[PDB]
Amino acid sequence: HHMKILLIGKNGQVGWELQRSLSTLGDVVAVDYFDKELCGDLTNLDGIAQTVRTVRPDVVVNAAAHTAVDKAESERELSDLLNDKGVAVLAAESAKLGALMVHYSTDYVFDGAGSHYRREDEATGPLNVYGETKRAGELALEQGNPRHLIFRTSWVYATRGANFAKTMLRLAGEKETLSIIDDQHGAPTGAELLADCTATAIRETLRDPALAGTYHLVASGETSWCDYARYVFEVARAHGAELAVQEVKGIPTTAYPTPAKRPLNSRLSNEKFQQAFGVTLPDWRQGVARVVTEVLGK
Numbered sequence: 001h002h003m004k005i006l007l008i009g010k011n012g013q014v015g016w017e018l019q020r021s022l023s024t025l026g027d028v029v030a031v032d033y034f035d036k037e038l039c040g041d042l043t044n045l046d047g048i049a050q051t052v053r054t055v056r057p058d059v060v061v062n063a064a065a066h067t068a069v070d071k072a073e074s075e076r077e078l079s080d081l082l083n084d085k086g087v088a089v090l091a092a093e094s095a096k097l098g099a100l101m102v103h104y105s106t107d108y109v110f111d112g113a114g115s116h117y118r119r120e121d122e123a124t125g126p127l128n129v130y131g132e133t134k135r136a137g138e139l140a141l142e143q144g145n146p147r148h149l150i151f152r153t154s155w156v157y158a159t160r161g162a163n164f165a166k167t168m169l170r171l172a173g174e175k176e177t178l179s180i181i182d183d184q185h186g187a188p189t190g191a192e193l194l195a196d197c198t199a200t201a202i203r204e205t206l207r208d209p210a211l212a213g214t215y216h217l218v219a220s221g222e223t224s225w226c227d228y229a230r231y232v233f234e235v236a237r238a239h240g241a242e243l244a245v246q247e248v249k250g251i252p253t254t255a256y257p258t259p260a261k262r263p264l265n266s267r268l269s270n271e272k273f274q275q276a277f278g279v280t281l282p283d284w285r286q287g288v289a290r291v292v293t294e295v296l297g298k
């Protein structure tokens, strides 16, 4: 017998790696909003509910979200649908089936104060619509399905998809100088790490259901966006890439404002996850070096 796993958001950065990592846990039914047979559109509340009822999963993994942080400030209804109302429907339908539901969240549920690595039960206080609707979805899942795993993560990148590492690598081909924010700090976390630790956590939580709850799932360490970009260029040049960029200048968040206010401290303690699931979470540089290498075809 094989468990039935429903993956929503299959085409995203994390969803694509979950198509790999979940494939040995059971029979995977993977959808995204373009699917024609099953509704994979998390904003179609009745349709996505019918998909859960049809598939009857043992595990639901939601990798779909509204992730365009600055656009979210002018798309508040859509952000609420994708990050809150849709998550509530998934929680209700999965709990009717007794299914374990996995959901991802964000460092942006916090206000960005301090310089410490945040523990999971600190008070939330989002500064932007993305964080507000993401936190509302967290609460909807907590109330709707006790059998859940919520993984807060940060600064996600991958070989496939759009992200800061690939954007920096492209811009470094063309621009001689880059001005990059140096006062926001967090851990770049790879879609690979998120997908593999998710599969591990699912297996361990099915074995020990007491492990349900909320975890910070990030790579270890911290960097500013500025030093992150510098590292991407260091790796690229070590693999023979020719880059135009000569200087990366650090600038404060106040220098050029964004529609969405961003937290300065995005550090998340990942000790709870390591202890609960018996995993090592490597320093953030490793996963970034790997993606840069793959993007360059090396």
Ligand SMILES: NC(=O)c1ccc[n+]([C@@H]2O[C@H](COP(=O)([O-])OP(=O)(O)OC[C@H]3O[C@@H](n4cnc5c(N)ncnc54)[C@H](OP(=O)(O)O)[C@@H]3O)[C@@H](O)[C@H]2O)c1
Pocket (backbone or CB within 6 Å): 009, 010, 011, 012, 013, 014, 015, 032, 033, 040, 041, 042, 043, 062, 063, 064, 065, 066, 067, 082, 103, 104, 105, 106, 107, 108, 153, 154, 155, 156, 157, 161
């Ligand atoms: N700030 C953070 O902490 C941060 C950063 C990255 C990711 N995350 C979280 O980690 C999870 C995924 O990470 P990601 O990096 O994979 O984000 P992503 O790459 O944007 O993947 C987003 C997924 O949602 C899909 N989607 C968009 N509109 C949809 C709809 N109406 N119905 C169904 N699916 C829809 C996207 O498809 P299209 O893109 O083609 O619409 C894509 O498949 C999300 O929970 C996200 O919030 C958090």
Ligand code: NA
Pocket (backbone or CB within 6 Å): 058, 097, 098
């Ligand atoms: Na069951």
